[PDB]
What we know:
CATH class of the domain at 16-106 in chain A: Alpha Beta
Number of strands of chain A: 13
Structural class of chain A: alpha+beta
Keywords: methionine adenosyltransferase, SAM, allosteric inhibitor, transferase, transferase-inhibitor complex
Bound molecules: ligand 7U2, S-adenosylmethionine
Largest interface: A-B, 65 and 68 residues
CATH topology of the domain at 16-106 in chain A: GMP Synthetase, Chain A, domain 3
Helix content of chain A: 25-40%
Radius of gyration of chain A: 21 Å
Strand order of the largest sheet of chain A: 1-8-9-10
Shape of chain A: flat
Entry title: Crystal structure of human methionine adenosyltransferase 2A (MAT2A) in complex with SAM and allosteric inhibitor Compound 1
Distance between the termini of chain A: 39 Å
PDB class: transferase/inhibitor
Assembly: dimeric
Number of helices of chain A: 9
Chains A, B: S-adenosylmethionine synthase isoform type-2
Oligomer: homodimer
Amino acid sequence: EGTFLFTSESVGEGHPDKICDQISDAVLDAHLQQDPDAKVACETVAKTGMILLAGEITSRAAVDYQKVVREAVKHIGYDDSSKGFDYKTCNVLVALEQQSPDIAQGDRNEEDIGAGDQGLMFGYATDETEECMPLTIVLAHKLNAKLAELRRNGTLPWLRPDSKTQVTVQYMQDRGAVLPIRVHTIVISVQHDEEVCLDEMRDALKEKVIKAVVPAKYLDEDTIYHLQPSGRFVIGGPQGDAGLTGRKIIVDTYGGWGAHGGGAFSGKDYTKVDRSAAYAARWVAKSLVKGGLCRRVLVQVSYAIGVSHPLSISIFHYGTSQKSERELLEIVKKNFDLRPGVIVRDLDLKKPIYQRTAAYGHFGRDSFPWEVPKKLKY
Amino acid sequence: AFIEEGTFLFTSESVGEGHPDKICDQISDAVLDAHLQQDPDAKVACETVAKTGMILLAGEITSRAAVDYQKVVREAVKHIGYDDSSKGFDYKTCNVLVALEQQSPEDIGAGDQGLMFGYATDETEECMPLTIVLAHKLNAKLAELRRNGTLPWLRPDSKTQVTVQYMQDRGAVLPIRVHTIVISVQHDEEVCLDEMRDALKEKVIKAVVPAKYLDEDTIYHLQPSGRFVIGGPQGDAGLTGRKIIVDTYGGWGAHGGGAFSGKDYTKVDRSAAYAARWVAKSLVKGGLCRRVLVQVSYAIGVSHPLSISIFHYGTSQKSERELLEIVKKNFDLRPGVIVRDLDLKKPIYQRTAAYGHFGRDSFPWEVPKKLKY
Lengths: 378, 373
Ligand SMILES: Cc1nc(NCC2CC2)nc2c1COC[C@@]21CCN(Cc2ccccc2F)C1
Ligand SMILES: C[S@@+](CC[C@H](N)C(=O)[O-])C[C@H]1O[C@@H](n2cnc3c(N)ncnc32)[C@H](O)[C@@H]1O
């Protein structure tokens, strides 16, 4: 037939894994506000009544970690025992040292600073949406964003921060391109208070959330809706659970499409090529699709610690381009300088913009420089 | 130029047992194995956190077992090789913080609407990409020479990265040569740089990478930072489940998102991921394909897979629907049945927490099933 199903997941800000991501990037932004050259590698752990920060920081900034964390938890929305977590009374432990001096040494100009680590990173784009992202992860992200929006404007006051969404879309293949046909299944689980009744929640999730996010041409009579499938969900977040920074990296990127090199984003400054090179790889892929050179493209780059030039660069257009992959590679080499010291300059990665990225996806939102396509010259 | 037009590069990485992320994976699965030995029906979701002098255990456990976490943690760190403050971490004196919430206590449906991927390629004997296989064995050779006194200046923390130059071959991929090798390993304060870099090329790389893949243009980045004395948890905080691509296919195939270590077999994204690899490897080893991606969809509540797609990249003489009918005649991919067929209630998981979950004969999902059709 040539038709397949694909599912992508997205979680809300209250998910324990995402709490750690946002806190880690909140610590990063705090240092960057005072020291644009701060070295930050801040991991976060969240369990019952605890937030723990562990990692390495080299900064001239004076940061109040107790208040940075508690304001992030407050922003996420956990302010009472009835929700399972409260920023006012939770335990905050800090185990932050200085960056390894062996790491810092391995003193040089801005344009050929070596990568802070080895690693491989992927970039991906697809013309199936105007965001150049897969429809499954775009819909999953926007659904969690609509839940938080309706929670914060008081129109659905029974909502709570923890949530998880899964969107299954039926796809058609066409010479390497993918055509979304219909939404097969939507799953939504969201934390809620004790007063609201189950049936009222499920109807509100369909009329006020799904219908407000999913275009009507993808929903039909056979679409399956799994709304609050586990029944009650009064307590969520870190209570009775455990979350870690960088445990939602597929949620953070392409929701299972493309490829992933394993590196996590949150809590890492721009010198960590896990973040800066992944943002640049998305920049390249989106510029190739928006520029009309392909319908769907995957990009890989890799680095070695202390070396500035990428060790390998590869392009794959899935057969959606008239031009061969090698000349796509040259168009990239002529338009992009993928050294980490040049990426930070081109993408303006010293700004405290990273707490915004820790939820609803790092890719597919016009607010970010790596999402603005580059006018290609060749 | 003729070579440049019909050739691509691909890079994968791996890390050693002393890498702080892998320390946590190892300890989390050691906790899982400890509970499974006494209680084969134990439910485990154990996260480990590693920083300077600290191992922290957090998560939820429902088990009848009585596990000495001090002994399990400190013996895992001892096995890894951190036994003195001169190495940045010591199992005898490190702080072990236990924050686990322990509770005392087939048609099992899927707890998540998830996607599981299995992948296999005939480019190596273990049916795995050469990039991730070479990267894995390079770390293993380091630990082997460290533990038997051959290179006594070695230390447990290490990272490797391999870039292979490939040629396409009728939908299958064919390794031509090793383009670039990166090795960084922790070391003591006395051995010199030139001595380290020569032993890494002569006694590590050439003992692992076949000679036909190495030439005079192969690029070597050996100890590229120049000094790797500080390592392990002291030089970098480590968390469970931060090496899921190292754990799987090194960038090839696809990945759904879930980590493996610290979770018992009732977690579908671990047991079914193993079964997806089991299916793909059986298709290639059975001659049905040279290269295949098995894509299994699970509908919430439902036990049987909701949909299975087979991407053979045109390397199969049969069609996708034919391959699908062969899979369903030879595999029962329900989660509860997967556990029994793969004997997953055994304490076999600490061995998986390093050097890759896929590509080693000593695992039930790596024994290809002979297909009847
Ligand atoms: C001519 C070509 N070039 C490349 N350039 C390597 C690159 C872009 C990253 N890759 C490929 C081909 C043709 O042959 C098959 C694949 C091999 C890799 N595949 C792409 C892929 C699929 C799934 C997960 C990760 C992947 F990189 C396509
Ligand atoms: C480079 S560190 C990530 C950044 C680091 N955590 C920081 O504080 O900025 C990632 C891995 O590199 C390895 N590593 C640590 N020190 C190194 C060094 N001096 N040279 C090469 N690799 C090193 C460690 O195994 C560590 O797990």
